[PDB]
């Protein structure tokens, strides 16, 4: 196996568009949102977690995440590096690429329970937290669906994180608020650099500029705009006019529908998968910090289920594995949820009950 | 024909930097300069209108864009995105990545006749406009200057859109002012992303990462910063100092003088139509919703114009076609300009008019 | 030689990214740093001399940087890209790209000088300074370092700029200070904007979508996040708790100090470069305008130090060159630091000297 320079190309420009939704996307996205007296301390958090993030990765997390171990994770074979050779190639680009790439999925999940909960949150509890989380819920469940592990080896369908990234870190989330906008100018600068950049995200975890690269732009443009349509109709149905957050959180909505589903699906697809979630996304919140669940939870669980509708030839999708029905696929996609909300919920209520007993949760 | 992995990766990387310049460019840009009290509302329209046509562009404006028809228009066979096999190649790249491309183009265009008008313009009024413009203006106008159309096979020549973008969202503009700073870093923060995201827009135009989309980056640069200086220092002539506004007014200047030309000039021309776009704009706005017309018209018809003239070989130009002088080129570029500025015209008056009769232009 | 698509491709958007440092990345960062009263002077300031140094080099800076000339300067044979055919290759990319990417690096080092100085100098001032400094400085130890000049001959390491870059502007700024933050958020958007944008400086100072690409951008992840982490230690071990500011300066040193060292490094001594230039970072401020030295130098100084140090084999680097030792090596980054020390102060002082004679240096 050589590597391929285009793909190199592509897969670190879409590995800096990626760390762009966190630094600052998500940040700038957060910051509109929380008291305006809470800003700076929040930004601080998700900066000094971004970096914590970054160097655990490079020290364990990616070896663990991706090296070959078992089902529920790999080994200590790659500690910072170590044993990757310079020029190693998987798939079609340099290993260290992949490290890079992977790296960045994980930060912007920890993004987003940070940006979160840092209103509520102490400092050295967030960072023990990370530390706990990161560790025993976003590496397993990584290599789990990407790592090959359990739900990959069971046929699971999950093109760019739809439950490692955002069930994962909703049910973090989630357990964050329950044992615990000024400037929406901001809020819209925030999602607009989490859209531009979820398109290194949703076409780099193709791993090469090709056409499932290109179908997965596509259909994250169109999923995004029918789920910003859905959401506003919804909202001009429910609260007789539109609002920007409502816009925002649309977006947001369809992208996060997407991410699961975006390298399987037909463009009529996307469509269908966006106007759902962008509904389901205002449904959610209408009936949480900063409703993370109430979009990236919901909208992830509905965009997983989907996949396992919308990837069938029959609908215009790339079509499922053979010898797989939609009956055993919906099936695979249900049990992949269920196993990644219940991961993330005991690893996380783990990691704040450790913080709580360290250095206690609630900022004094 | 099969597609180059590069200009795969180029060109979505491009499209990426295109959607950047609405989402949040644009937006960002007019957002500083409306009133603060109708920001929010802006933002939202400029959205959701975006939203919009990304739809409409998937349903059927791609295929009446740049499917074979006539002069005027292409077909409805690609509805949907219906018989373009995944794997279909268009020219080195994927089809399915210059239907992302060109839409991107769309999207730009209409964000900045909606950026400047919708503090005048009622929500269901501008959705209306849209619709009606979208397809009867910008679809038929990229058709006949990009999609082998009429204006094509006379030999106009418009690199990234100085007629389709510019000139045409102008005059949309110009059609709506006539029937119906607060914030400067903010402005600037716009015109930056703007300039940045221009990059995708111009050397993506070549369809991929040769040595014309090298040349056309590098007048990018040129023109910009000619249309800055000539800007600032007509300012400095007229009003004693320059000013923030008038810098970021020259960039911009500069970069639509050069969107038609960059491809087709050499560097020295670029400077040259960066000065004279530069100077040209700061008399348009100096003798109209956010001076759209006053920079996008007026630069978009001088660097047309101009194009005609520094894409001789004479000038450092790339060469005109074979039998073509400068003469008959430049006769070319008026007969094109002048049937973008009626065409968009009769087809804005239209649409306002049409959302007039419906639901009424005037914000209640 | 024939030019690599990918490459061109991977250069190009890396180009785009480094024009995002200082449009509108460097400006955002000293927007939230200088009095109110200030900013929007600064930012023309700085838009405005961005928009001079593309033109100088364009006319003859890069010529003067790139073409074959002395241990010191080229020559005028690329005067405005004369002799240069469109279709030239310079290592694996058409020339053209070379020309965009090397002038996007002079326009950060330039911005990083403007910023700092913009409220103590007058505007007519700043544009003599910087006409000087730009041909006198930047140009030579652009071509010392990187056009094959005096340093570069002697083997001096220095992967994308902590001499040229860094160093350089760091001095130029104390000679200026020596002579002559009310947003938070929008320091954080500037730093944000910097470090995004800093991968395309780092990773793009290859040539190419290679394994030192890959290995330049994994370094630039890893020595950010160490010097974040190390800076905010020191931090709350001096000042008793983190700040938004320290974070963000440690980010800056981090992206500093491995700047000279990205491409020669592993992982573990990029890991210890951003822990010990976060450390010296802080150290810098602790004991100048808007810290450009402080920062930009201190780190610059210890980063091009290192790269002597963890280039070795021994400490998982790329090697030294064939016959060098440690201690060779080492010997030459101390002359290569002295030597842009004293020839950058001796040129600043020239050109801040001619500015004042002229026009008067102390704004009005």
Not at 171 to 189: D, W
């Amino acid at each position: 196996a050589v590597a391929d320079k285009a793909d190199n190309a592509f897969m670190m420009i879409c590995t800096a568009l990626v760390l762009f939704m966190t630094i600052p996307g998500i940040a700038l996205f957060y910051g509109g949102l929380i008291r305006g007296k809470n800003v700076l301390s929040m930004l601080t958090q998700v900066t000094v977690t971004f970096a914590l993030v970054c160097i655990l990765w490079v020290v364990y997390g990616y070896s663990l995440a991706f090296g070959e171990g078992n089902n529920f994770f790999g080994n200590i074979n790659w500690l910072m590096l170590k044993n990757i050779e310079l020029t190693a190639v998987m798939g079609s680009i340099y290993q260290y690429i992949h490290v890079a790439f992977q790296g960045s999925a994980a930060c912007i999940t920890v993004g987003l329970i940070v940006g979160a909960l840092a209103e509520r949150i102490r400092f050295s509890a967030v960072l023990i937290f990370v530390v706990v989380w990161l560790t025993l819920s976003y590496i397993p469940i990584a290599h789990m669906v990407w790592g090959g592990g359990l739900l990959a080896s069971h046929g699971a369908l999950d093109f760019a994180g739809g439950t490692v990234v955002h069930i994962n870190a909703a049910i973090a989330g989630l357990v964050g608020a329950y044992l615990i906008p000024h400037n929406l100018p901001m809020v819209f600068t925030g999602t607009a650099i989490l859209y531009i950049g979820w398109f290194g995200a949703n076409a780099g975890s193709a791993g090469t500029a090709n056409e499932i690269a290109a179908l997965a732009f596509v259909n994250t443009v169109v999923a995004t705009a029918a789920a910003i349509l859905g959401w506003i109709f919804g909202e001009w149905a429910l609260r007789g006019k539109p609002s920007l957050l409502g816009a925002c959180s649309g977006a947001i909505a369809g992208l996060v529908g997407v991410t699961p589903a975006c390298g399987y699906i037909g463009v009529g697809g996307a469509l269908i998968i966006g106007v759902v979630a962008g509904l389901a996304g205002l449904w959610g919140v209408t009936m949480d910090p900063c409703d993370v669940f109430g979009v990236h939870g919901v909208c992830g669980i509905v965009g997983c289920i989907m996949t396992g509708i919308f990837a069938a030839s029959s609908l215009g999708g790339v079509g499922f594995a053979e010898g797989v029905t939609m009956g055993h696929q919906l099936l695979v996609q249900l049990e992949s949820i269920a196993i990644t909300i219940v991961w993330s919920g005991v690893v996380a209520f783990i990691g704040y009950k450790l913080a709580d007993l360290t250095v206690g949760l609630r900022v004094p």
